[PDB]
Predict the 3D structure of the following.
Amino acid sequence: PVFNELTRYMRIKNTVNDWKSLTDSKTKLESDRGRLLAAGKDDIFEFKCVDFGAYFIAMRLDKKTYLPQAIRRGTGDAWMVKKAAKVDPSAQQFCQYLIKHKSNNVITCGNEMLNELGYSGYFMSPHWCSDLSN
Amino acid sequence: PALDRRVQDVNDTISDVKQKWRCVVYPGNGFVSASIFGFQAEVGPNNTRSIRKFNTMRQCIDFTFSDVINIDIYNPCIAPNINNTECQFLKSVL
């Protein structure tokens, strides 16, 4: 007989619940910060190519949740256009191309990213959601 | 970090920034896509290569970043018809 099967399974299911509650509370905090940040800015809800140093991301704020969302690459995470130098006009233009042609596939930091990919992007530097919350 | 590799991205593998294609104004004659290999070209009379000129920046980007490997290339620096001005324009824009 294995000694704490039930009490460990319950701590694990409660662990998963606590992961999801931490994710949701972080989502809520970031959403409210989004509302306070967005105030007085145009094209905050429009995709823009943002330089994260080693790559570009096409991103914006959601109009509803107010969370950061980016153009998604296939079935994975946000499309990160890799740069090969501090100045990479080609990567920047490709990111503009993504905006004009691939913007129907989008991924949002927080709960949605947890559902779609199994992680929230939050509290996991250098992920782009963490860099935004920093 | 989840990466859907089914979707192709040239930027994944190109370490040399000058190997990347980028759209630049060709003063007088519109826009062109350029890299160290030269300019993207169209088959100009005599089945030769002439620099592909675009009316707008967006047509250039769309053409450059579309799907195919963009095989037709005109290089003015090493062609037997070297164009030293069009070659200097090339290396100035890179």
Notes: The helical segments of chain B are 57-64, 84-93.
